[model samples]
Target: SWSEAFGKGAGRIQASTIRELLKLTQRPGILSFAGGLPAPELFPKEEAAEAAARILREKGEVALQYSPTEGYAPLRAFVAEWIGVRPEEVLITTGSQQALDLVGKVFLDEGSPVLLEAPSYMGAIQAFRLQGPRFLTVPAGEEGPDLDALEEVLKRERPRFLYLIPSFQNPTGGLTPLPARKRLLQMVMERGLVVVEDDAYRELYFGEARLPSLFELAREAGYPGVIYLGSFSKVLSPGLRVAFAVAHPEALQKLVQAKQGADLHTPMLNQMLVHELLKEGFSERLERVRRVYREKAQAMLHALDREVPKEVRYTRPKGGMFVWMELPKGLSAEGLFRRALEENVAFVPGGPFFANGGGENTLRLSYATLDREGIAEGVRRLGRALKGLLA
Candidate 1:
């Protein structure tokens, strides 16, 4: 048997390490800080059930029928209003993952230059790699990507788009400050380059004030180059698989066509259910969810402070599900991971998050699904494993 059976693109796609590590996490008594999952207990199950029953009772025929590739009109309109974009500029998809896939499908060609933060979202890296783009990475600092490096890359390379997760970014939990957001937009605008703004974690902020997004700043300057992605997966149920994109009409149209070829459209029943949930005290639900996550983030940070070695650096996330850690030189996160599994705790090694290569000394931990007690115990186990590696 030869390796020639599958297409070249299929060969480029790799299994998500987080998805694979989740299997080991499911073993009995393992405390997992691996997956970027929302607290299941926080899901509005009762509300979802009521909305589902109502939709089936009154709008079953329409909900079950095939709909436009652009997505359900009412939901699209709601997303447009929510994000301060026009309905024509919005395209709903089966979660933001599909939106990323469509972006790659619409824009990328084999060997095309693509730009990303050094340790960006693993899912985005996976989705974009299918087209075999030449990945160029800029260092992801605390406030965002290093602008000096980012500017150098922009000037040197002709990248199709710059993908960024500015607010509480995955793997790093770093927020791009307003100044950096403005500067980033300015640089991309100068080059007439497109920016893919993945704002999946925007609403999950733990602080009182929200920083303006690159999309908002770009819109203010009348720049039409940003494609903004938003998702209900963080706040609402991810299982419903509802997310949306806001872009210039021209780009949105291409995404719509690409989506048409993918799944025709996201499920109408789920869309209707989400619409109903939005109408029924969604704000209160958001407030409750924010409070819970804020507490959990603090718990994880406190536990890390008490447990881990001082040389071990970790992010103090203002908001978001993840806390990223970097071990001192010469310690491998993958090595600690094996020892952690022996201690009945699990986390994802950060090496897989890098687009180009590196981050072997890094790892990511999620506190969203764990209670305070579970968080403390899990970190204790992890700290023990990490100390052993240090020794």
Candidate 2:
């Protein structure tokens, strides 16, 4: 397997929190409250299976064949149509993961500064970090990143770009309020800092009034500094690995070039499958998921409040799949994570998720993959794991 002789990867490799946390869930009764996996029951397994066979039967060789780097035209058009943008502005990616990778390569040069939320999306931090960009992180709060701190950081760092997971953000599971989004728009535009908004989980909203995406707001404001990354993975099925990025043409073109040499293009078969799913009742599946996730999220919040000790502080997310929690000041989250694993309860410790690497008191809980009963039970197990500390 070590074909390169050195037996190392292309760049720095850190032990993943997911992998390190995996050992705790080996028992039959374990309740995993860690991964942000979509419900397997909701996946269009039957429909997708049919679509894959249909693609092979109809498109034949084209389904398995190499494709153009820009996109396969129909899929690009569909992606554009899905987001209400022009087709020319969209670039198909393997997933939003690949979008992050391509952006890191295209935009970041040696020593270029990248603005990041203090506890932002983990993968985004990894991608940018590998490229040698000087990371400027602003602390994360309930209603998105602290805009005042962000503006100050932007002014101080003069970063090339900023990365945000605005709606129902990863780890924290917090939404940036409308006023804050507006302030972000104003501040970024005023400071002239480019933003790469990761709207991967935006569709999982549980609110009556959803704030406009930075990319959407920019168009209304007649400005052009935001690039939006989207994925059908969670909404549809992550196994499909389908995603698209919308950006300024010039900005997108550079990413397209980077993507060309990386993976020629996202698989044509998956693209066709995603296209088929959007036919007429196009997004009924997504709407149903949002409703179900709302109920599931409620169960988690209720159980966590009831079970988690008063000494522990946890995020009260409005939507999305994760809840970040912090242990008592003196306790180690890594130790808690380990003990929870021993008790057959699972959660991700918070250290690796932090770019500056110091959230030792924190951990992340996920509610998306489990049903209400499962979520309640999982939280109960986690509470049991921590009960002695409270005592």
Candidate 3:
């Protein structure tokens, strides 16, 4: 049955697309601007290693045992407290990636209409595709997804759900302004459509007051339509494979039921480890990541200014791991990437970042992994590559 299920349609997943697509970027000498990594140096490895040791030492057998499908209670409760929600509202998963997959399984029936950002997170698109939904896109400008087009689509079809990445969104590093966020929540309230708000990067905000999370904003309005998703993968160690979702009791219940069949539970050890880490001030760890990313992002911005061709347009982000850059006229971003890779500098092509497919001249650069010197070298290589192409 598993073979049959994946033999046909599932084969569309080009494992090669992402499998080692990032490997070149990871090579020691190469300057990679292609990953969504939080500087490895800032990871609270010392704190986490201590937590793991304590878990094994204190709760050995149970720490290694299976957990409830609803997830480890203390960690679930911790997430609730961190987000100002109740324990009943939290449903933990393997990771936010898994959470998105579960959303497809729970909500999307084949051919169902779904509203999404035009240039969306590639991983979300791929996960949701397994369920076979008809996805349409809305453009994202500096602020976030354009509300005008959103309203147009929503008014016309009343889709099953609207997926969004409101803060430091992947590829774009764009934050939906407070007004836009408020308006989005208002629209959800009015339409009663489920909105999946992936705030994995919520803690990665830069400038002024971090606007209320969709979950927080919805709660404040006394209405619940947002399915909030978060993962420690971006901030903490990915080995933990931890993520959580918060939503209306009814929605959460659906996920719980579906989750029971998926994995029975996320790992008990990971949950316990996170619980211990949170007690030791996960907020402090978040601040540590924020400070380091800010410096790295600034380095990339400076390099782009100093070396990138004038025709290319890129976003100057507030706080996020990436920059969305558009190639100059007459040049394909695929061409840019190939040339850059030849010089041992790698970047993710922008076309794949789009949901419906058409950003051939666009590219995404992540500045979160490398340091200032690496950023400069990477940019210089990219500049040389582009110059060669133009000639």
Candidate 4:
């Protein structure tokens, strides 16, 4: 009877695959490709320490006390100017995941339908599932969400909003191309579909020029349906848990209210730290992060080409942390995960990323946390496991 106070959805929510895999990090000697973590060695720790010290020295009281739910004004203004949006339109949240949760609370209803890319961000999927929304999936490929599948699904279900990670998408590392972005904007406008564009990895590109963001294009096209989620988690520091949502004025107010109920506000100290850190060398830091991830990704790709058996199929990503792989027929990632861990290597199975289930043959590997040598060693161990299993 004590447990009856919880909603039906609480019983349905299971621990996330990533969360479960993180437990294995405790096991010494394990080579993990599981967590989507940025390399720790690359973080500008000294610079960050100096920034934190400066903020506490100058704005100690303000940094320590409660602040506006709308977020620190100068930080908000900086994010707005950076993203080409008005300051008032920005709502800061604890993280992009919190932005997802607030979005779910404000927008989703029990059994309401939400459009999704087939293999979507597991974190967002878990966040929205708590609100009990029906997930309608569309197929996504290298160029992004399949236009054919997108139109058909929208014609049929007309779900509340479309949630997608178009730039260096998690678990898949797939970027939705500009042409598709334009068409997506048109479709959203025609059908009046609201879009939650998760842009966490957009700034992590290897060498290419920046692609036109859906938020930028949507605004230029006079469409107000897109809510852009940006994070310092990737470019700056995940430990800060700082991210912002740029949305329409009305939607921004609703998110702000939702945030107030959640945590009052993201800690003022973290905001000031990010603001102060950005004041000096943010761009240079971003370029360094990009270079680090790029190098690691290249090494992982090279090792996969050289080491893995021909029967296995894996994505060669242009940017971001993950490499999505499909096992040869009749081989299960779940089974492989156990065998790989026995060899002191780990990866996340792809089943969790597919909201509808049935991806036992797929898995995801992350190259962001490891150096080139570690990546090569991890892949060698993984390849050896796969070969052993098949043999």
| lDDT tens per residue, model 1, 1-391 | 4567777976887665746854653645878898877888888799889889999999999899998889889999999888898888889899999999999999999999999998999989999999999999999967789999987887789899999999999989998988888888889888999999999988888889779888899989999999999999998888799999999989999999999999999999999988989966777888888899999999999999999988899999988899999998788998888999899888889988998889999999999877999999999998889888888
The digit string of per-residue lDDT tens for model 2 on 114-139 reads 88877888878877777777788888
| Model 4: lDDT of residue 247 | 96
TM-score of every candidate relative to the true structure: 0.97, 0.94, 0.95, 0.97
Candidate that would win on lDDT: 1
- Per-residue alpha-carbon lDDT of model 4 for 1-391, expressed as tens digits? 7588887787657756756865765646878899887788977799879988988999999999989999999999999989998899998889899999999989999999998888888988898898888999987666688888998887788888899888888778888888888988998899888999999998898756768889999999898989999999888788789999999998888999999999999999999888988867777888888888988999999999998988899988878888999988789998999999898888998888888877789899999877899899999999999999888
Question: What pairs collide in candidate 1?
Answer: none
Give the whole-model CA lDDT for all candidates, comma-separated.
0.90, 0.82, 0.83, 0.88
Would you list the rank order by lDDT, best first? 1, 4, 3, 2
User: Each model's RMSD to truth, in Å?
Assistant: 1.3, 2.5, 2.1, 1.3
Instruction: State each candidate's clash count.
Output: 0, 0, 0, 0
Model 2: lDDT of residue 256:
92
Q: List the residue pairs that clash in candidate 3.
A: none
